[PDB]
């Protein structure tokens, strides 16, 4: 699927799909040398959550998650807490952007986080409409180069994310004005 593609960006709402999804999450990060921990799977199915899938003409290769800032916090707390509640004390709407993962043996790739650009857009709208001051982010370093390009400033060290059992740095973009945090802005 690369010469007649079919890319389908959704919020997945069956309990098959999310499955799937956190099918995607473990093979991923079992690839990589991540460690799979239930904390995030409890997160998910949580209320603050909401989870959002790639599809190639209807099986899932993609999928990302947003986690809103409630009485159940954020997974960054666990490291990143105190970079965050100079925010909440100011009365900030946080929510943390988690668990992105894709299956790079369903889907013809590049042979790359630029490819899970329709799974962006959907948080990025989420983000507008939900009226979120920061979208946060703890990456793994290989990628953080990217996420600086896509305007999102380091508000965190790096760390080692226990959780992971991985090096992380703690990103965070601003919103209602994104587009005066990333160069690409230049070209619209
Ligand atoms: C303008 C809108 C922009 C939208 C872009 C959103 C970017 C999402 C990046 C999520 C990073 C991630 O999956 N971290 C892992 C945590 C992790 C894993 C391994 C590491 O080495 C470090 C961190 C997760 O949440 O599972």
Redesign the pocket.
């Known amino acids: 699927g690369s010469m007649t593609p079919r890319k389908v960006a959704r919020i997945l709402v069956a309990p098959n799909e999310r499955d799937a999804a956190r099918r995607i ?1 473990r093979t991923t ?1 079992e690839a990589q040398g ?1 460690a799979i921990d239930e904390s ?1 799977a409890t997160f998910l199915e949580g209320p603050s959550a909401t989870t959002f899938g790639l599809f190639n003409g209807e099986v899932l290769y993609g999928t ?1 998650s947003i986690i809103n800032d409630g009485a159940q916090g954020l ?1 960054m707390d666990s490291i990143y807490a105190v970079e965050l509640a100079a925010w909440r004390g100011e009365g900030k709407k946080l929510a943390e ?5 894709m299956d790079h043996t369903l889907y013809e790739a590049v042979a790359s986080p630029f490819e899970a650009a329709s799974l ?1 857009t959907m ?2 709208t989420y ?1 507008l409409e939900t009226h979120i001051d920061y ?1 946060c ?5 290989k990628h953080d180069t990217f ?1 600086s390009l ?3 400033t380091q508000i965190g060290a790096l760390k080692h ?1 226990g ?2 059992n ?3 740095i703690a990103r965070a ?1 601003y919103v209602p004005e ?1 587009r005066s945090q990333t160069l690409l802005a230049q070209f619209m």
């Open positions: 999450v990060y991540y995030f990302i997974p952007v988690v668990q992105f993962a962006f948080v990025l983000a979208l982010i703890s990456i793994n370093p996420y896509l305007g999102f994310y959780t992971v991985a090096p992380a973009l994104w």
